[PDB]
Design a protein around this ligand. Structure first.
Ligand SMILES: CCCC[C@H](CC(=O)NO)c1nc(Cc2ccc(F)cc2)no1
Ligand SMILES: [Zn+2]
Ligand SMILES: [Zn+2]
Ligand SMILES: [Zn+2]
Ligand SMILES: [Zn+2]
Ligand SMILES: [Zn+2]
Ligand SMILES: [Zn+2]
Ligand SMILES: [Zn+2]
Ligand SMILES: [Zn+2]
Length: 203
C-alpha cells in the first residue's frame, strides 16, 4: 500500500506523496497507533521529520521541489494514523549569529491531543497555508492561544507539554489533520479577517 512505498529505505518523501484537498482521507478521524510501534510506523515518523528538514534546507528543497514547512501529518501522505511531525526553527540574530537552540520544537508525536487550553484565542497575522491546498486562502485561522498537549514518542514514552505562540498554532494545525479538520474550517465564513475582541494576533 502507500505506507510500503513511503518506508522503502531509499525513498524520500516529496510533494508527489502528499494528497490534495478533496481526497477523502483528509476528512477522516485517523486511527490511534498501538505500542510497541511497528517498524513501518517508526520509519514513517522518521521520513516525515526528514521531509521537514529537507523542506527547510534551501538546497534539498530545491533538489526535491519542496515548499518550506513546519509540520506534516500522516493523513497528508494518505496514511490514516495519528502521527505528526513538527519542526519549528529559531532564527538568526541581526548580526548573523545562529540561535542558541536550532529549533523551538522538534518532535515526532504519536497519538497527540489537546487536553486543556486557554480561553483566549490567537491567530497568525499572515494566515495559514497547507501542503495539501493549492489555492490562496485569506483570513485569520482562529485557534487556542495556549494549549497543554499529551503525546507519545516512538518509544511509547508519554509526554505532557504546554505550548504558546507559534508552536501552539503549528501543533494545533497538525492535530486537526488527524481529526479530519482543515485550517479554513476555522476561518470566519462571512469576513475572513473579523477580529472578536481579545483575539491575540501573532506576528
Ligand atoms: C500553521 C501551520 C501550517 C503548516 C504548513 C504545513 C502543513 O500543511 N502542515 O499540515 C506549512 N505551510 C507552510 N509552512 O508551513
Ligand atoms: Zn515519493
Ligand atoms: Zn529508527
Ligand atoms: Zn537529507
Ligand atoms: Zn492526561
Ligand atoms: Zn475546550
Ligand atoms: Zn496542514
Ligand atoms: Zn480545541
Ligand atoms: Zn468557509
Amino acid at each position: 500500500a502507500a505506507i510500503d512505498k513511503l518506508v522503502k529505505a531509499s525513498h524520500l518523501i516529496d510533494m508527489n506523496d502528499i494528497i490534495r484537498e478533496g481526497n477523502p482521507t483528509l476528512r477522516k478521524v485517523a486511527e490511534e497507533v498501538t505500542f510497541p510501534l511497528s517498524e513501518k510506523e517508526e520509519i514513517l515518523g522518521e521520513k516525515m521529520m526528514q521531509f521537514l528538514k529537507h523542506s527547510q534546507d534551501p538546497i534539498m528543497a530545491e533538489k526535491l521541489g519542496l515548499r518550506g514547512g513546519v509540520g506534516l501529518a500522516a493523513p497528508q501522505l494518505d496514511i490514516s494514523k495519528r502521527i505528526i511531525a513538527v519542526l519549528v526553527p529559531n532564527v538568526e540574530d541581526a548580526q548573523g549569529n545562529p540561535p542558541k537552540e536550532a529549533y523551538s520544537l522538534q518532535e515526532v508525536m504519536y497519538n497527540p491531543k489537546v487536553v486543556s487550553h486557554s480561553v483566549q484565542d490567537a491567530a497568525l497575522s499572515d494566515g495559514e497555508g497547507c501542503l495539501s491546498v493549492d489555492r490562496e486562502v485569506p483570513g485569520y485561522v482562529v485557534r487556542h492561544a495556549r494549549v497543554t498537549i499529551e503525546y507519545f514518542d516512538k518509544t511509547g514514552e508519554k509526554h505532557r507539554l504546554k505550548l504558546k505562540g507559534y508552536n501552539s498554532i503549528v501543533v494545533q494545525h497538525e492535530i486537526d489533520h488527524i481529526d479530519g479538520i482543515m485550517f479554513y474550517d476555522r476561518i470566519n465564513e462571512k469576513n475572513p479577517f473579523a477580529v472578536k475582541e481579545g483575539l491575540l494576533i501573532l506576528e
